[PDB]
Design a protein around this ligand. Structure first.
Ligand SMILES: C[S@@+](CC[C@H](N)C(=O)[O-])C[C@H]1O[C@@H](n2cnc3c(N)ncnc32)[C@H](O)[C@@H]1O
Length: 335
RNA sequence: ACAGAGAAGAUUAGCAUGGCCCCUGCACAAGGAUGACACUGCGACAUUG
């Protein structure tokens, strides 16, 4: 009402589906536990908790800055019957953006939509069409810097996300992420007519989501992409026959732990045992007996292909080494 | 009714650069080969909004 007064945007729905895919692609053996969310900037609409409840039955905590917006969020949830699922908090301009858990479990994800102006003169200079809601010191980069700074002290929250409305933002915030050595992040490019958006999610945990969620197809921001998670190959009929035997001999001759999972073949590596360094260190008397770096990935076969999708790890060297070894394994059998 | 095109110049053919798999090697470096790759450079061109 104060700033939105329109339900036409489906970007809220797509942001929530991105949350769902980012969680369901990174859950694993973990049970379907109660999931609680955080909406920094719940606003007088609180669309994010509402559609994260009506769509996947999550729980939510909404942190607001404005008295009117806090009251309106309370009313909205009161006539929505998620009183027992969602909570709302009013905070002053100086409070930390991440509220205390207050005895419950730590949030599974934090998700925001930072304010995106700096001055009222700049408001008018760019677009003050007739309308501290849209004002902050630094913009969507300064707010993201605050969130990044406070995300050192709450690492239990798995998936931190932030939404950016200017392409120039992605360089700065991704540069700060690389300064703080957050390897597991991602950019998701949206599309609404001509408008584009950038969901720069970042986590401090091992689970890596799908490529379609961290690496956008367009190579415009190719310098800012996270590491690769999936490396696909194309097969030919003799390999499309001997694929099972070749994968067996590869994964068994290299001292590589593995086990099958129905229609998907798995792996569980606690040390690189396929690199040349692995066999040299095993064959040379040295104090270290393992090249560190965990990994979980799945090798599946679909229609003359082979996929190596990463599903765990803090280190990209292990994934790249396994991918290259597998590619050579295909090559030394196709011919 | 209020957050990427509204622009730097880009992308790309390409030439370098960098790791990765392979071989050689005790290590580091060092070297070849190859071909699955970029969070690195410069653009013989080619065309755009
Ligand atoms: C673009 S609005 C996000 C509104 C969101 N799209 C919604 O569902 O209404 C930016 C938000 O930043 C929040 N915000 C700004 N500074 C804050 C602070 N210090 N503490 C809490 N929230 C803050 C405001 O409450 C505001 O809702």
């Amino acid at each position: 009402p104060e700033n939105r007064l329109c339900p036409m945007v489906p970007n809220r729905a797509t942001y929530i589906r991105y949350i769902h895919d980012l969680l369901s692609s990174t859950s694993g053996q973990k049970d379907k536990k109660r999931i609680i969310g955080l909406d920094i900037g719940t606003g007088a609409s609180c669309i994010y908790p509402l559609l994260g409840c009506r769509m996947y039955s999550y729980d939510f905590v909404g942190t607001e800055i404005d008295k009117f917006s806090f009251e309106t969020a309370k009313s909205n949830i009161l006539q929505n019957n998620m009183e027992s699922q969602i909570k709302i908090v009013l905070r002053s301009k100086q409070d930390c953006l991440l509220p205390d858990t207050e005895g419950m479990e730590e949030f599974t994800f934090v998700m925001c939509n930072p304010p995106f102006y700096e001055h009222e003169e700049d408001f008018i200079n760019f677009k003050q069409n007739p309308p501290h809601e849209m004002v902050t010191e630094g913009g969507e980069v300064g707010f993201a810097n605050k969130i990044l700074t406070e995300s050192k002290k709450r690492k239990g929250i798995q998936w931190y996300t932030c939404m950016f409305g200017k392409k120039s933002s992605v360089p700065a915030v991704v540069d700060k992420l690389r300064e703080q050595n957050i390897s597991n992040y991602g950019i998701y490019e949206l599309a609404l007519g001509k408008t584009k958006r950038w969901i720069i999610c970042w986590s401090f945990q091992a689970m890596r989501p799908h490529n379609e969620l961290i690496r956008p197809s367009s190579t415009s921001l190719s310098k800012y992409f996270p590491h690769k998670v999936l490396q696909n190959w194309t097969l030919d009929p003799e390999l499309c026959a001997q694929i099972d035997d070749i994968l067996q001999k590869f994964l068994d001759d290299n001292k590589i732990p593995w086990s099958k999972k129905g229609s998907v073949l798995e792996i569980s590596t606690k040390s690189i045992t396929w690199s040349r360094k692995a066999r040299r260190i095993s064959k040379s008397q040295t104090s270290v007996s393992s090249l560190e770096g965990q990994m979980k990935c799945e090798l599946n076969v679909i229609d003359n292909q082979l996929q190596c999708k990463w599903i765990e790890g803090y280190d990209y060297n292990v994934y790249e080494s396994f991918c290259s070894a597998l590619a050579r394994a295909l090559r030394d059998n196709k011919k």
